Amino acid sequence: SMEQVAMELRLTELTRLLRSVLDQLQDKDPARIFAQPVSLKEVPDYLDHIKHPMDFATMRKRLEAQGYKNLHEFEEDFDLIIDNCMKYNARDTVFYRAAVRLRDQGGVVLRQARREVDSIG
Ligand SMILES: CC(=O)N1CCN(c2ccccn2)CC1
């Protein structure tokens, strides 16, 4: 139907917007601390601590599969990256501090993304 095509066009455009958001968020992680899943070879107990691991590569996979139906689902995954890190790593670590900086700087990008999604529809 035409309605399905229109829906698919909107999702493709949402995906385009979120791709831009993801690139911007990732730029705020210059150390690439969050670029890839935490290695279970290097951190074998990681899943005892963190029940829902997340990272930017995994988000990008879902993104290109058009697996984010709305901005909320995308934000949930971004929050997992930060919140997982701030639990697994102690406050006085480069990892915890990277997550805080990513959270703070990312908030700006996400704030404008929410306005754009609402506005464009
Ligand atoms: C981002 C994050 O939470 N990580 C968990 C702690 N960590 C490592 C790396 C090697 C060995 C032990 N831990 C870095 C990744």
Residue 68, domain extent: 1-121
Q: What's the structural domain count of the chain?
A: 1
Contacts (Cβ under 8 Å, ≥6 apart) of 70: 14, 117
Asked if 58 and 88 touch (Cβ cutoff 8 Å), the reply is no
Q: Give the number of C-alpha atoms closer than 13 A to the C-alpha of residue 9, restricted to the C-beta side.
A: 8
Asked if 81 and 54 touch (Cβ cutoff 8 Å), the reply is yes
Asked if 79 and 28 touch (Cβ cutoff 8 Å), the reply is no
CATH number (domain holding residue 23): 1.20.920.10
Cα distances from 114 to residues 14, 17, 37, 46, in angstroms, run 11, 11, 26, 32
Type and span of the H or E element at 67: none
Measured in whole angstroms, how far is the alpha carbon of residue 116 from the centre of its chain? 17
Residue-by-residue DSSP string for 23-48: HHHHHT-TT-TTSSPPPTTTSTTHHH
Method of determination is: X-ray
Contacts (Cβ under 8 Å, ≥6 apart) of 58: 37, 77
- Two tokens, residue 18: 């979120």
Asked if 24 and 30 touch (Cβ cutoff 8 Å), the reply is no
Which atom of ligand 1 lies nearest, measured to the CA of 84?
3
Distance CA 80, CA 86 (A): 10
Which of 32, 34, 38 to probe ligand 1 with, by most ligand atoms within 8 A of CB?
38
What are the CB-based long-range contacts (under 8 Å, 24+) for 30-36?
31/94, 31/98, 33/85, 33/94, 33/95, 33/98, 33/99, 34/81, 34/85, 34/98, 34/99, 34/102
